[PDB]
Amino acid sequence: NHPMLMNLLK
Amino acid sequence: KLSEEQQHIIAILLDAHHKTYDPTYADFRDFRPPVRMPLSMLPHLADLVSYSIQKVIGFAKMIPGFRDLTSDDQIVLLKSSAIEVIMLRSNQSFTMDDMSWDCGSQDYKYDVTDVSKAGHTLELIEPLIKFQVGLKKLNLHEEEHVLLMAICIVSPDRPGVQDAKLVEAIQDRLSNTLQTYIRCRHPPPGSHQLYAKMIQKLADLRSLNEEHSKQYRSLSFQPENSMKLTPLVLEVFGNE
Numbered sequence: 001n002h003p004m005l006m007n008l009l010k
Numbered sequence: 011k012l013s014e015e016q017q018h019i020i021a022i023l024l025d026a027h028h029k030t031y032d033p034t035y036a037d038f039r040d041f042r043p044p045v046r047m048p049l050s051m052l053p054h055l056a057d058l059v060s061y062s063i064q065k066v067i068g069f070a071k072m073i074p075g076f077r078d079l080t081s082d083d084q085i086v087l088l089k090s091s092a093i094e095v096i097m098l099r100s101n102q103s104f105t106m107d108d109m110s111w112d113c114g115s116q117d118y119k120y121d122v123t124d125v126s127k128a129g130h131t132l133e134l135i136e137p138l139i140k141f142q143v144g145l146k147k148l149n150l151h152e153e154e155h156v157l158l159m160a161i162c163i164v165s166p167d168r169p170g171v172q173d174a175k176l177v178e179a180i181q182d183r184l185s186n187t188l189q190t191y192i193r194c195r196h197p198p199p200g201s202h203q204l205y206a207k208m209i210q211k212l213a214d215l216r217s218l219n220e221e222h223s224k225q226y227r228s229l230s231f232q233p234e235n236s237m238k239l240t241p242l243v244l245e246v247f248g249n250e
């Protein structure tokens with residue numbers, strides 16, 4: 001998974 | 011001759027860029043310090059790159075339609091073009107004066123010796139410098155510049171994309187906006203084959219990406235170096 005990336009996409 | 015919609019797309023991208031391309035050195039002070047003598051520049055550059063990836067994500071998120079893609083397509087598109095968009099946006103700080111990326115101070119001035127001090131050879135550096143020079147020589151309008159970045163990111167042919175059809179419709183709107191912008195606003199003879207040269211640059215970016223990856227996988231394979239990376243760089247570029 002890509003936690004930080006996902007979060008940054010928000 | 012260039013719908014209001016196309017002018018709208020351009021206005022968006024120019025905006026997205028002004029908001030995401032804002033290095034302040036105050037942001038640069040927060041990076042691990044640049045240790046110029048090997049791998050002495052890896053920590054500093056890893057932070058610059060990590061910071062940049064966030065900027066690209068912010069920019070990408072601003073691309074019309076990009077938000078209409080599933081989280082995986084966006085993810086796939088970003089970790090696929092991150093390095094490419096960064097090399098691309100860096101052309102703004104790159105200077106022909108002495109073939110370097112000058113961001114104000116001598117501290118934040120990066121040349122070929124600095125990049126190699128981060129783990130690269132001319133395998134990547136030579137074609138990279140050639141890319142920056144060729145980019146300057148195209149003397150692109152900011153409008154063209156921002157469109158090329160968006161087109162680089164929203165590319166249908168990036169391996170791993172699930173809904174290439176929607177990614178394609180998006181890229182196509184952008185391409186057409188670009189081509190139309192070149193015909194109507196970029197001065198001839200400078201507009202001749204300009205779109206084609208811009209595509210070629212994007213092709214060169216693919217090559218540069220491959221070259222980055224070869225070295226990256228190699229470097230990241232060495233823990234003492236891999237531990238000097240950032241969590242984001244590891245997440246986007248890859249990890250084992």
Ligand SMILES: C=C1[C@H](O)CC(=C/C=C2\CCC[C@]3(C)[C@@H](C#CC#C[C@@H](O)[C@]45C[C@H]6C[C@H](C[C@H](C6)C4)C5)CC[C@@H]23)C[C@H]1O
Nearest residue numbers: 033052055056059062097099100103111120125128222226
């Ligand atoms: C805000 C911005 C300003 O224009 C300033 C910028 C300058 C860009 C530069 C100057 C220094 C060298 C560059 C990063 C050039 C480069 C490169 C590269 C690479 C990667 O393989 C990797 C992978 C990890 C280990 C090492 C360090 C980190 C983490 C990046 C190698 C291509 C763009 C150049 C970046 C831009 O985003």
